[PDB]
Write a structure and sequence with these properties.
- It is classed as transcription.
- Keywords: Transcriptional regulator, Structural Genomics, csgid, transcription.
- Two copies of one chain form a homodimer.
- Chain A is of the alpha+beta class.
- Helices cover 33% and strands 23% of the residues of chain A.
- In chain A, a hairpin with a 7-residue loop joins β4 and β5.
- The termini of chain A are far apart.
- The interface between A and B is large, with 49 and 50 residues.
């Protein structure tokens, strides 16, 4: 109901240190809609951030697509009440990232009208408090530049690789590869970087050994 | 002299002559010069904010391999430096700000939460707006992601390949030959081996047969 959206904003980072009265004045000047997003949906694009997003429940990570890479993930946002992508709402030029994607069932809040023009008709002490909350929120996001980046995993692949090698397996238990890496990736319906990654683990833990065009099975018990 | 430089700074532009006098009577504005290759401030003991009169400053980070990664050089007169560390900032990615040419600054002393709390509420708002703008327009090259090479350079083509086959613990295991990698990255085999050698001198990586160890994980991610 209308009271539910109010309490979610009072507990957010944007409204810390404000009273119950200052909250009523602000909501008479902004539009707050509760929208839900499913897995792998796009929350916003860094080039077109038209509203301020507040996280209620879920997981939202900023992302990017390399030319041949599937998707790289920056630091995600999981804490309720934390603003997401509010920096691109004020200034954007050539952002390294392209969009923020959702990873699980997620609910957010869209704040419309957060701009100097609308905020001018507010209490002086209220404006000072909101600018501090925004400054505090933008301040903490400068620590994200040193976060280790990853890719998108492909669930079961070690079984799909072993099944391919079980087919191409000769009667003597040996394997001679006759297809390229890009061909094997398309047949397994996976990406080439993820195909060569699991082969690295299987060589690390000493299960297989790829010598030229031969795949020597060192341990078929797990296989 | 200090008045006309503080008047045209990005922190005050938008403030009347009366509001400007009220600010200076509460904060100290020193003018001290810095020599070439001198530390302006360390990110752990930032207490004063700086206004660039004329020079060249750039935040830096010392990597384990010995190289010093530099951000965007603050060279426009009247631009703010160190405003990112007005709050505590917890563990800062960047380490220090170093001058690269003879530089004149304005060491504004006494700017913090409590001191601003003793000013006009309409004057505080104008500072928080100019501060929010100054902070936001530098997030693109200081806060978002630092990149050294381009998407087409040979050094990034290999770094993106080595990253795509990197385990969750950081280990890398090669299952392809020097030829196959050069065809995948669309580069000549000598060009590929040159860059792998350049990345070996600089102690970025070390190729021990089929295993490549990322010796310095900080300058490596700057190629992704």
């Amino acid at each position: 109901n209308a009271m539910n959206i109010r309490t979610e904003l009072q507990n957010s980072q944007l409204c810390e240190g404000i009273t119950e009265a200052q909250l009523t004045e602000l909501m008479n000047k902004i539009t707050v809609k509760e929208k839900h997003y499913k897995n792998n949906e796009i929350l916003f694009y860094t080039d077109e951030v038209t509203k301020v997003y507040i996280l209620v429940k879920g997981n939202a990570a900023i992302a990017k697509n390399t030319s041949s890479g599937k998707r790289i993930l920056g630091k995600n946002v999981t804490e309720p009440g934390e603003l997401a992508g509010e920096i691109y709402y004020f200034s954007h030029r050539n952002p390294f990232w392209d969009y923020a994607i959702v990873l699980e069932p997620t609910t957010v809040l869209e704040i419309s009208g957060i701009d100097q023009g609308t905020l001018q008709t507010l209490d002086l002490a209220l404006q000072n408090q909101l600018l501090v909350n925004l400054l505090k929120s933008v301040t903490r996001k400068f620590e994200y530049i040193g976060e280790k980046v990853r890719m998108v995993s492909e669930d079961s692949v070690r079984a799909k690789i072993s099944n391919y090698l079980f087919g191409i397996q000769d009667d003597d238990g040996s394997i001679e590869l006759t297809e390229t890496r890009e061909e094997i990736a398309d047949y397994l319906d996976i990406t080439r970087p993820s195909l060569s990654r699991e082969l690295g683990r299987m060589q690390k833990e000493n299960i297989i050994r790829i010598e030229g065009s031969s795949v020597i099975i060192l341990d078929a018990i797990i296989f």
